[PDB]
Write a protein that binds this ligand. Structure first.
Ligand SMILES: *[C@@H]1O[C@H](CO)[C@@H](O[C@@H]2O[C@H](CO)[C@@H](O[C@@H]3O[C@H](CO)[C@@H](O)[C@H](O)[C@@H]3O)[C@H](O)[C@H]2NC(C)=O)[C@H](O)[C@H]1NC(C)=O
Ligand SMILES: *[C@@H]1O[C@H](CO)[C@@H](O[C@@H]2O[C@H](CO)[C@@H](O)[C@H](O)[C@H]2NC(C)=O)[C@H](O)[C@H]1NC(C)=O
Ligand SMILES: *[C@@H]1O[C@H](CO)[C@@H](O[C@@H]2O[C@H](CO)[C@@H](O)[C@H](O)[C@H]2NC(C)=O)[C@H](O)[C@H]1NC(C)=O
Ligand SMILES: *[C@@H]1O[C@H](CO)[C@@H](O)[C@H](O)[C@H]1NC(C)=O
Ligand SMILES: *[C@@H]1O[C@H](CO)[C@@H](O)[C@H](O)[C@H]1NC(C)=O
Ligand SMILES: *[C@@H]1O[C@H](CO)[C@@H](O)[C@H](O)[C@H]1NC(C)=O
Ligand SMILES: *[C@@H]1O[C@H](CO)[C@@H](O)[C@H](O)[C@H]1NC(C)=O
Ligand SMILES: *[C@@H]1O[C@H](CO)[C@@H](O)[C@H](O)[C@H]1NC(C)=O
Ligand SMILES: *[C@H]1O[C@H](CO)[C@H](O)[C@H](O)[C@H]1NC(C)=O
Ligand SMILES: *[C@H]1O[C@H](CO)[C@H](O)[C@H](O)[C@H]1NC(C)=O
Ligand SMILES: *[C@H]1O[C@H](CO)[C@H](O)[C@H](O)[C@H]1NC(C)=O
Ligand SMILES: *[C@H]1O[C@H](CO)[C@H](O)[C@H](O)[C@H]1NC(C)=O
Ligand SMILES: *[C@H]1O[C@H](CO)[C@H](O)[C@H](O)[C@H]1NC(C)=O
Ligand SMILES: *[C@H]1O[C@H](CO)[C@H](O)[C@H](O)[C@H]1NC(C)=O
Ligand SMILES: *[C@H]1O[C@H](CO)[C@H](O)[C@H](O)[C@H]1NC(C)=O
Ligand SMILES: *[C@H]1O[C@H](CO)[C@H](O)[C@H](O)[C@H]1NC(C)=O
Ligand SMILES: [Ca+2]
Ligand SMILES: [Ca+2]
Ligand SMILES: [Ca+2]
Ligand SMILES: [Ca+2]
Ligand SMILES: [Ca+2]
Ligand SMILES: [Ca+2]
Ligand SMILES: [Ca+2]
Ligand SMILES: [Ca+2]
Ligand SMILES: [Ca+2]
Ligand SMILES: [Ca+2]
Ligand SMILES: [Ca+2]
Ligand SMILES: [Ca+2]
Ligand SMILES: [Ca+2]
Ligand SMILES: [Ca+2]
Ligand SMILES: [Ca+2]
Ligand SMILES: [Ca+2]
Ligand SMILES: [Ca+2]
Lengths: 1337, 5
């Protein structure tokens, strides 16, 4: 069973051969598989592999403490070092060459004579010690000191044992071996050893230069700063942000957050081109995979990490989950890791993260005491990462596995505010935002960083341009794109079975089960927010987007919908009042309409008729628009507060929600007619509507009672869903498969519940800012065809738009200023009723885009039309600049006033930076506020906090480590001074948390205490339905509604049992399901004689009736406006039946349709059909008849004039095997003269009965074809033969049938004698079975 | 209030 050792012991198989000795014979440890660990594992000293997350967590998993080595930030030494002395105060180590030399060389200064201790420097008892090497003076007297590779033994100062100098920090810059000379340095290939410690780059490479951003421009210089060259200058107030290069191709890349673009250029400054300009808005940093030809990009408007090729074509998002605030990025393609930094996540934790170069296997590389981590650089030859921190103000380094943390700089006087960093050989160049300069720093330990280039602006990311910075390595994707269909993204060398790459697909595609071939995406969750419009996979197991985010500089997106047949999404932008359309990939952005849009709150798309509906909450109306050609009209106009609208194309219904006090949900035909409420009882704030396509059930969301309901499309069979946890205010709603997706404003999240009950509430997103509608993208849903988009014709034969109508019918419509002609399908101009209108009023400038702007916004220097059309050809005569803008004196250019003398040359001729006042004057800010050299003023409390408040560094100048902060400012022990407003604020602002530890919370009368005291929340959040405190102390103990009854101030519906506010009791509107809240005990409402009592009970001035607006909020005051002046037998048919001259009423749909139904032709008399017009759902022939629409293009001349087969396009039948009849019908050739007619064409050439020349009796012969239709079907109203022999000009017209048959009276049909008077009615009216004929049973 | 901010 198990494994038995050679010593006679049983050991489990899992612990057999796992580096554990087990039995003393070590039988299970003689064999060695113990293969090298993968990318996701850490390798212990003994060869055991453990998962990367186990590293530096507190557990000695490796049994050698190799995974717990130096996780602290080098708090203190370990017995100091050989030939070095330890300062007791802080653990700093200095050598004897500085000890007792006469200078305090460590922070405590204990290495010299002190008057408080009496210690003196000189010889002493060392004569008795007799040390192994030498004696030297210490303040305690003579003490031992030993050469390299000699350290004192265990509590034996006199005895020195050999030491491994290879473990000392900075002994050799690249590599070290201890087998010879007690140690020896060596260098990687390409470097050349100088002296005996330092490795420098060989002169076989062309040159070495450093590239950094000046804060405005892109600079370059040598390693000593003798000469500096501007590489590329920023245009249009640009700002170089993050820089990286590619030595093989001699290209330098840099991002632009102000211009929201990413550029690239040659090292000579030639061929500067834009790499990306779509969906990239704040590219903080950048990185280049130099062997796979990739460009990894950081984004912070929608926090994500992208990868795009060097030219910028193939794009795909890699990391999106919990990514918070990404700032730094670095990578090592040769080994295969991606390192990126994060100064705050969706969880409050900041961290430095490690990942594979395709986003897999994310790990917290450095987590403790990380503050505000910033850009990251790598030591490609020693396998270490370097990151800088702006909060705790240090530069630190850890290995690729996060072990052996060592600090190279620390303090508010050393690195007050680092941003970027880069290594070359032995120096870390780091930008600092406080000293306002790129600084050169040693990469092991520094007493003071040197200034490399002092700037007037905040500098930014730095890089060192050299070949050795990009070591050579093979390309896993080089073997024919790695076999991937679209994109090959490099990964760890041990990933994908050693192939070292993982296949990816560009936006709009997903990987199949082969993980090699891309397929078009079918489903994803589309949602909108204030900042972006995003598309997310439904499966919560993955997190990355499927569609590019949609974003702008001003942004407030609300409504969204999609067009699956074009891979297109629509959206609105309330900051621009425009409706856009954009592909999934991001290309092809176009506007739909930008004219007369006022707070469009929602959108919906009729995917069969290609009509777009949107709801104007400002105009208080809903509009429809045809995408084929811009054609819009208001179909519902007099609403109060309309919200989300949803349309059902196949059923021909649209649904819209209104939440004014008499809240309701309406339904109407897609035409915009037959408006009626379907849910008006027990509603408040019905925000979101959604439709279950698989069941034709309407789902809607309420926000005043915090409920989600559903019902049939008729509003009947209403059901509520169960209680949903932490739902307080839902806005969006979407039903897809078995899940219901909702968005809550109070949560600021997207939650998922089961669509049949309350469900398992699962949070999809969190911290999504202001969140708006959701929508389920699904290409399978957008399938179907009403009569509006049936083949053999187009658009239902209607000009402009045709509207689907329930019961499978269509109604034609035309835009504003158009009227339907007599045929009810084509529309003519109607200027008499709806005159043409201008794009803008007389006080506003119409842009080239359909928008409208104030007339004094023309030529103000700011693009307000979103087309630059208001800032076009400005500065010339008849086109002067606005009084607010500043005009350049030459060339006709107007610029914004705020750009006038702001130290940037904006005007093309520089007129904006010439002869403006230098007089700061004796003007002074108040005595409380410190004054900078820039004359900006800040309080004294802000000075020397390592924050560049003055924007010129004046408040941080001459700051020193003396530890002598102002009385107001608190002092971190060795970090910086700090303001009181940050002491005891819930956040650790000092490095060690000295400003937060030991304090207590304290709260006013408007706040509440969590039970554990962890936080002091606002009293507004007490008893709200949302768990705010971590211990849930807020919602515990809230008032509980008595079982069955309701609260004190809440009416109860007697018929249902639900609760409504007492303000709704006796208000005139029945809110209860049975109208119990408007009982007969309600006091009647009275109105004054000077007012008008509106139908909802309001009192309004009688002057205001027909004044121009529904002041009652009901149509009452505007409905009744005739005020506008100029300035035979007795029986009868039913209401819907036509009356003939001879009676026998016929239904009105039979009127004037080429069928005689009255007998006398009254339903088809030319006088009757002269004025009659077709119903809107019926096709009008050119003759004037009204055939049902389903008769159109059906091979049959049912209209008579062939007007309904005129213009029909018919699919060509395969004449090689089918027969194309004369009427266009497609029938198989095998069915030609098969026995009965199938074509039924005018030709009637289908059924010729080709083989036989005659037919026997009973099945009698027909006239021109030998079909065997019996004579019993003679004169029966249809041509059974199809050749006249049944209608028979010979029989049934000469004399009454054969001797064995009788002719019926209706139809005039000859029937067999054994049918005649047999006891069963064989004629249609029973003329064969009257009482006259007699006969018996 | 249920108003789009
Ligand atoms: C990574 O590998 C590439 C390709 O092997 C290296 O680039 C090439 O390096 C060689 C030297 O080994 C260069 O040859 C030299 O070229 C100059 C200029 O023509 C000439 O004056 C010298 O006499 C010598 O022939 C070669 O130009 C260079 N470029 C290419 C594309 O072949 C690269 O140096 C390697 N980098 C590292 C860090 O290993
Ligand atoms: C609330 O909606 C209901 C429908 O669910 C309305 O009831 C209809 O009222 C009309 C007359 O206005 C009747 O002709 C219908 O037969 C009623 N039911 C149907 C089948 O629609 C009710 O009027 C609405 N109430 C308010 C206050 O608008
Ligand atoms: C306002 O001044 C501008 C600048 O001269 C004029 O712009 C010209 O307009 C005409 C007609 O649209 C165009 O054909 C020209 O190309 C425009 N620019 C040039 C080259 O002159 C504009 O016409 C002026 N408007 C008025 C009313 O004077
Ligand atoms: C001192 O060093 C000796 C070396 O053998 C060791 O045995 C002893 O335990 C040590 N004592 C202390 C207190 O460190
Ligand atoms: C992006 O760049 C391309 C190429 O220069 C250009 O055609 C396109 O108009 C640009 N779009 C924007 C928004 O700048
Ligand atoms: C804060 O602290 C004091 C006690 O130190 C307490 O009396 C006071 O009411 C608290 N006030 C505020 C501002 O919450
Ligand atoms: C028509 O039928 C022939 C013979 O079966 C076949 O080869 C051809 O592909 C068909 N063409 C069309 C358009 O149906
Ligand atoms: C074809 O239609 C015409 C009327 O347009 C009709 O007169 C003629 O009889 C029809 N042809 C046949 C074979 O019946
Ligand atoms: C050890 O195994 C890993 C996978 O766990 C890699 O295959 C690696 O290349 C192996 N190392 C050697 C030297 O073969
Ligand atoms: C003018 O306004 C009407 C509505 O009042 C229509 O929207 C019409 O299309 C407008 N005309 C133009 C040119 O936009
Ligand atoms: C010229 O046009 C601008 C457009 O904003 C202003 O209307 C301005 O008042 C005009 N006149 C002058 C003198 O600038
Ligand atoms: C500077 O300006 C402030 C605000 O007006 C006071 O007037 C102050 O007295 C001034 N300081 C001096 C030295 O004149
Ligand atoms: C340090 O300098 C400040 C400067 O305002 C004060 O002079 C202070 O008295 C000094 N000494 C100490 C110990 O804070
Ligand atoms: C809720 O708690 C209150 C506390 O006063 C009352 O006990 C009330 O009866 C409780 N009701 C329910 C349903 O738990
Ligand atoms: C109606 O009459 C009552 C008295 O019966 C009050 O005067 C009331 O104020 C009247 N209605 C209004 C709107 O004034
Ligand atoms: C025919 O058209 C007229 C207008 O020309 C009316 O709309 C009439 O109602 C229509 N016919 C029917 C049956 O509705
Ligand atoms: Ca073992
Ligand atoms: Ca561990
Ligand atoms: Ca000294
Ligand atoms: Ca609520
Ligand atoms: Ca403007
Ligand atoms: Ca300027
Ligand atoms: Ca700082
Ligand atoms: Ca400051
Ligand atoms: Ca604090
Ligand atoms: Ca709460
Ligand atoms: Ca009521
Ligand atoms: Ca009115
Ligand atoms: Ca008829
Ligand atoms: Ca027809
Ligand atoms: Ca046939
Ligand atoms: Ca017949
Ligand atoms: Ca009969």
């Amino acid at each position: 069973k198990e494994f038995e050792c050679g010593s006679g012991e049983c050991i489990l198989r899992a612990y057999v051969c796992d580096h554990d000795n087990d039995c003393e014979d070590n039988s299970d440890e003689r064999n060695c598989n113990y293969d090298t660990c993968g990318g996701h594992q850490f390798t212990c000293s003994n060869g055991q592999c453990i998962n990367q997350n186990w590293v530096c967590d507190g557990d000695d998993d490796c049994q050698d403490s190799g995974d717990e080595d130096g996780c602290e930030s080098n708090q203190s030494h370990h017995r100091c070092y050989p030939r070095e002395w330890a300062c007791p105060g802080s653990g700093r180590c200095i050598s004897i060459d500085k000890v007792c030399d006469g200078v305090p060389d460590c922070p405590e200064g204990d290495d010299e004579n002190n008057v408080t201790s009496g210690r003196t420097c000189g010889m002493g008892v060392c004569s008795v010690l007799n040390c192994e090497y030498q004696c030297h003076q210490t303040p305690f007297g003579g003490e031992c000191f030993c050469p390299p590779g000699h350290i004192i033994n265990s509590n034996d100062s006199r005895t020195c044992i050999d030491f491994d100098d290879c473990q000392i920090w900075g002994i050799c810059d690249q590599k070290c071996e201890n087998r010879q000379g007690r140690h020896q340095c060596l260098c990687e290939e390409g470097y050349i050893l100088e002296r005996g410690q330092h490795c420098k780059s060989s002169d076989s490479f062309s040159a070495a230069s450093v590239i950094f951003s000046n804060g405005r421009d892109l600079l370059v210089g040598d390693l000593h700063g003798r000469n500096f060259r501007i590489l590329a200058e920023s245009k249009n107030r640009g700002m170089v942000m993050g820089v990286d290069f590619h030595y093989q191709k001699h290209r330098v890349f840099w991002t632009d957050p102000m211009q929201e673009k990413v550029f690239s250029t040659d090292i000579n400054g030639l061929n500067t081109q834009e790499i990306l300009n779509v969906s990239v808005d704040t590219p903080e940093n950048l990185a280049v995979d130099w062997i796979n030809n990739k460009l990894y990009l950081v984004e912070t408007k929608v926090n994500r990490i992208d990868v795009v090729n060097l030219e910028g074509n193939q794009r795909v998002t890699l990391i999106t989950e919990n990514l918070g605030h990404p700032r730094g990025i670095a990578l090592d393609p040769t080994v295969g890791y991606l390192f990126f930094s994060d100064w705050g996540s969706l969880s409050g934790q900041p961290k430095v993260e490690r990942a594979f170069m395709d986003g897999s296997n994310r790990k917290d590389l450095v987590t403790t005491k990380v503050g505000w981590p910033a850009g990251i650089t790598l030591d490609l030859v020693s396998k270490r990462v370097y990151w800088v921190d702006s909060r705790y103000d240090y530069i630190e380094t850890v290995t690729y596995d996060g072990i052996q943390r060592k600090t190279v700089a620390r303090g508010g006087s050393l690195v007050p505010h680092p941003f970027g960093i880069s290594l070359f050989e032995e120096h870390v160049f780091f930008t600092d935002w406080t000293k306002m300069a790129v600084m050169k720093a040693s990469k092991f330990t520094e007493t003071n960083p040197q200034v490399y280039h002092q700037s007037s602006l905040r500098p930014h990311g730095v890089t060192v341009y050299h070949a050795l910075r990009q070591p050579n390595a093979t390309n896993p994707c080089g073997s024919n794109n790695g076999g991937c269909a679209q994109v090959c993204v490099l990964s760890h060398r041990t990933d994908n079975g050693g192939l070292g790459y993982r296949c990816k697909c560009e936006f709009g595609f997903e990987l199949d089960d082969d993980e090699h071939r891309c397929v078009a995406v079918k489903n994803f969750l589309l949602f909108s927010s204030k900042t972006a419009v995003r598309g997310i996979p439904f499966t919560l197991s993955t997190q990355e987007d499927v569609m590019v985010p949609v974003t702008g500089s001003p942004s407030f997106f609300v409504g969204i919908d999609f067009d699956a047949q074009h891979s297109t999404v629509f959206y609105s932008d309330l900051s621009k009042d425009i409706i856009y359309k954009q592909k999934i990939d991001g290309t092809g952005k176009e506007v739909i309409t930008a004219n007369r849009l006022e707070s469009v709150e929602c959108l919906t798309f009729d995917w069969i008729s290609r009509n777009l509906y949107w709801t104007d909450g400002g105009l208080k109306s809903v509009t429809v628009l045809r995408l084929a050609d811009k054609s819009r009209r208001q179909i519902i106009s007099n609403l109060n507060n309309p919200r989300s609208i949803v349309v059902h194309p196949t059923a021909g219904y649209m649904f819209l929600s209104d939440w004014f006090r008499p809240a309701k949900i309406m339904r109407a035909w897609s035409d915009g007619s037959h408006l009626m409420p379907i849910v008006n009882t027990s509603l408040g704030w019905p925000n979101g509507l959604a439709i279950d396509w698989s069941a034709s059930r309407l789902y809607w969301v309420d926000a005043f009672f915090d409920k989600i309901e559903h019902s049939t499309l008729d509003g009947l069979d209403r059901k509520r869903l169960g209680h949903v946890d932490q739902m307080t205010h839902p806005f969006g709603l979407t039903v897809f498969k078995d899940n219901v997706f909702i968005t809550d404003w109070r949560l600021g999240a997207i939650i998922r519940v089961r669509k049949s009950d309350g469900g398992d509430m699962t949070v999809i997103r969190r911290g999504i800012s202001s969140v708006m509608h959701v929508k389920a993208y699904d290409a399978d849903l957008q399938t179907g065809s009403n009569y509006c988009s049936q083949t053999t014709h187009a658009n239902g034969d209607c000009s402009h738009f045709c509207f689907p109508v329930p019961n499978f019918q269509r109604v034609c419509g035309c835009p504003y200023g158009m009227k339907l002609q007599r045929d009810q399908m084509t529309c003519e101009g109607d200027p008499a009723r709806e005159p043409p209108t201008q794009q803008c009023g007389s006080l506003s400038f119409p842009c080239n885009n359909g928008k409208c702007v104030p007339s004094f916004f023309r030529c103000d220097g700011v693009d307000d039309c979103h087309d630059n059309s208001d800032e076009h050809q400005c500065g010339v005569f008849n086109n002067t600049c606005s009084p607010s803008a500043f005009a350049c004196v030459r060339g006709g250019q107007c610029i914004p006033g705020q750009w006038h003398c702001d130290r940037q040359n904006d005007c093309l001729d520089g007129s904006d930076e010439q002869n403006c006042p230098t007089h700061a004057t004796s003007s002074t800010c108040p005595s409380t506020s410190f004054t900078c050299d820039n004359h900006v003023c800040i309080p004294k409390d802000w000075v020397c906090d390592t924050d560049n408040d003055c924007s010129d560094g004046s408040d941080e100048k001459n700051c020193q480590a003396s530890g002598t902060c102002q009385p107001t400012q608190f002092r971190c022990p060795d970090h910086r001074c700090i303001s009181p407003l940050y002491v005891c604020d819930g956040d650790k602002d000092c490095a060690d948390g000295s400003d937060e530890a030991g304090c207590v919370l304290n709260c006013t009368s408007a706040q509440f205490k969590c039970a554990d005291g962890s936080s002091c929340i606002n009293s507004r959040y007490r008893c709200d339905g949302v768990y705010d405190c971590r211990d849930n102390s807020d919602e515990a103990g809230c008032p509980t509604r008595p079982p069955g009854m309701c609260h004190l101030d809440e009416f109860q519906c007697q018929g249902d049992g639900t609760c409504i506010p007492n303000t709704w009791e006796c208000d005139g509107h029945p809110d209860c399901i049975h109208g119990s809240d408007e009982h007969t005990g309600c006091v009647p409402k009275t109105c004054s004689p000077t007012h008008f009592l509106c139908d909802n009970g309001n009192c309004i001035y009688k002057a205001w009736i027909c004044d121009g607006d529904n002041d009652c909020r009901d149509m009452s005051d505007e409905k009744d406006c005739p005020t506008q002046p100029f300035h035979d037998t007795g029986t009868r048919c039913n209401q819907l039946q036509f009356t003939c001259l001879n009676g026998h009423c016929i239904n009105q749909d039979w009127k004037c349709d080429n069928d005689n139904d009255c007998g006398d032709g009254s339903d088809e008399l030319p006088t009757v059909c002269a004025f009659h017009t077709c119903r809107s759902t019926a096709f009008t022939c050119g003759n004037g008849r009204c055939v049902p629409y389903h008769y159109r293009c059906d091979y049959y001349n049912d209209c008579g004039d062939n007007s309904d087969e005129a213009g029909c396009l018919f699919r060509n039948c395969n004449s090689t095997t089918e027969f194309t009849c004369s009427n266009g019908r497609c029938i198989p050739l095998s069915y030609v003269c098969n026995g009965i007619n199938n074509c039924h064409d005018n030709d009637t050439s289908d059924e010729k009965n080709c083989p036989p020349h005659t037919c026997p009796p009973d099945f009698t012969k027909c006239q021109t074809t030998n079909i065997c239709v019996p004579r019993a079907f003679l004169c029966d109203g249809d041509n059974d033969c199809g050749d006249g022999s049944d209608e028979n000009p010979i029989y049934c017209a000469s004399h009454t049938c054969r001797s064995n048959e009788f002719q019926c009276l209706s139809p005039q049909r000859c029937i067999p004698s054994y049918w005649f008077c047999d006891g069963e009615a064989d004629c249609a009216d029973g003329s064969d079975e009257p009482d006259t004929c007699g006969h018996s049973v | 209030x249920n108003x789009x901010x």
